[PDB]
Design a protein around this ligand. Structure first.
Ligand code: HEM
Ligand code: HEM
Ligand code: HEM
Ligand code: HEM
Ligand SMILES: *C1=CC(=O)N(CCCCN2C(=O)C=C(*)C2=O)C1=O
Ligand SMILES: *C1=CC(=O)N(CCCCN2C(=O)C=C(*)C2=O)C1=O
Ligand SMILES: [Zn+2]
Ligand SMILES: [Zn+2]
Ligand SMILES: [Zn+2]
Ligand SMILES: [Zn+2]
Lengths: 106, 106, 106, 106
């Protein structure tokens, strides 16, 4: 999937989680988020088109995905344990990682 | 790329790290490994081909890559700090993750 | 040290980081936060003094420290890399973790 | 507690995790190991007393506890999801981290 589509998948599923009634819905969403974040790994964002892959900027760009992936991984544990409110909080909190990357690279 | 080729990227780059003389070499190899781990995320392994994308087995299989990716993330920081020896040890330590997945799923 | 004293140390050093114009000062402050956060691990806050040490509340309280500890760990690598602004932003970001625990447990 | 006593707690609990019959027994042991590893954070090992608190050795020593704490955290989630063989597997894998530290500093 292209970068924009993975980003839409991340946005859609954060909202699903916010509004979720049960653990299954939160798990399903976090699962789709993980897959989207992992597929985005390799993408070159428009603002860095003129920079190579091994470029310093691209390393720092990709670093935000390691952070996101890790927060997704741990939130899915909280959902697996039926700790719905807790998993919803972890999801709300990882917005800071979304925002930081957008602020610098969108 | 396919799962086999991602494994070859992981294997190859690990020996590069093993034998490397400087930080830049280790950084480049970890970067390639991180892309290959992320790309592997959604692969279905030959031995789980009778299991569904949402099944305990496929969740456990992907969990192994969350762990791998985490370890590669940290190892790159060590490489970035030019802590080459400490980076090669992390790369050695994460081989436990490679092998753990293999024993269960290869 | 007690929990209040660890909280003062976390806060005081977060302010040092915000004010800092160099990596050395951010590193040192992140190091002291790490120590304060690990020392707070086993504290029982007043609002949970009526709860079992194995309660879901107490497990969730300690989980907030795990999150904080890992955010400090990553920010410190950023600081070791002389990514002064990126380390400051990470420190800014982990305030969400401080805020979340406080709102539930203080 | 002092470094030696926390190391006893780490070692005793590992062996309890080995032999455990149920998830409750693994959860409880891992909880105890988390606390022991967090309490050990600050400790100056005998082999490094003559080093500065901000020497590379001490930074590296503390780093190993970050790695250990994150691994205990993840295993505890597996134990809480009743994935007892997977939590036992994760626990017995900790020894990669235990051994690496002992090799350099014990
Ligand atoms: C975190 C979970 C997260 C969300 C949510 C998110 C959403 C998001 C949207 C809705 C867009 C707009 C899509 C569009 O083009 O209309 C968007 C765009 C970009 N993002 Fe994002 N994003 C989240 C996380 C992250 C992270 C962690 C990074 C960088 C590491 C990142 C980056 C970007 C970039 C670049 C774009 C613009 C891409 C484009 O338009 O082609 N996001 N995101
Ligand atoms: C860790 C860094 C890592 C390495 C290195 C590695 C290597 C590796 C090789 C060389 C192969 C054989 C490829 C072939 O075509 O014969 C192989 C195969 C598989 N692996 Fe692997 N592998 C590493 C990590 C991991 C992890 C973390 C997992 C699971 C989460 C995993 C899984 C597998 C599977 C399944 C195979 C078989 C694939 C096939 O036959 O098509 N590996 N790996
Ligand atoms: C994150 C870096 C963080 C900061 C900063 C912080 C600050 C802070 C202050 C300044 C206080 C007031 C202490 C006082 O009485 O003088 C305070 C108090 C509490 N905190 Fe805190 N705090 C941060 C993080 C966290 C986290 C992550 C948790 C829980 C996981 C947490 C908890 C608490 C609690 C409980 C108190 C009240 C203590 C008491 O009144 O006895 N904090 N924090
Ligand atoms: C990880 C799970 C882990 C285990 C288990 C473990 C065990 C252990 C023992 C049994 C000892 C000696 C016991 C005694 O009573 O003297 C011991 C001692 C030391 N350790 Fe350890 N240890 C584990 C992990 C770690 C980690 C991650 C580190 C460093 C980051 C570490 C370090 C040390 C040191 C230093 C000692 C010697 C203590 C002394 O001589 O005073 N260990 N550990
Ligand atoms: C998902 C979350 C949840 O709480 N449940 C109920 C069954 C889980 C039962 N338990 C334990 O109490 C400990 C492990 C375990 O699996 C879900 O299905
Ligand atoms: C890569 C690793 C390394 O040590 N060096 C040498 C320059 C170090 C520059 N520094 C600091 O000393 C502290 C932060 C920082 O960026 C590399 O180029
Ligand atoms: Zn967690
Ligand atoms: Zn690290
Ligand atoms: Zn990082
Ligand atoms: Zn996990």
């Amino acid at each position: 999937a292209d970068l924009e589509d993975n980003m839409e998948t991340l946005n859609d599923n954060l909202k699903v989680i916010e509004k979720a009634d049960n653990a299954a819905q939160v798990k399903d969403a976090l699962t789709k988020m993980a897959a989207a974040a992992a597929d985005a790994w390799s993408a070159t964002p428009p603002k860095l088109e003129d920079k190579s892959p091994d470029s310093p900027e691209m390393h720092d760009f990709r670093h935000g995905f390691w952070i996101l992936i890790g927060q997704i991984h741990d939130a899915l544990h909280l959902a697996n344990e039926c700790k719905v409110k807790e998993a919803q909080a972890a999801a709300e909190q990882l917005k800071t990682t979304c925002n930081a990357c957008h602020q610098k690279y969108r």
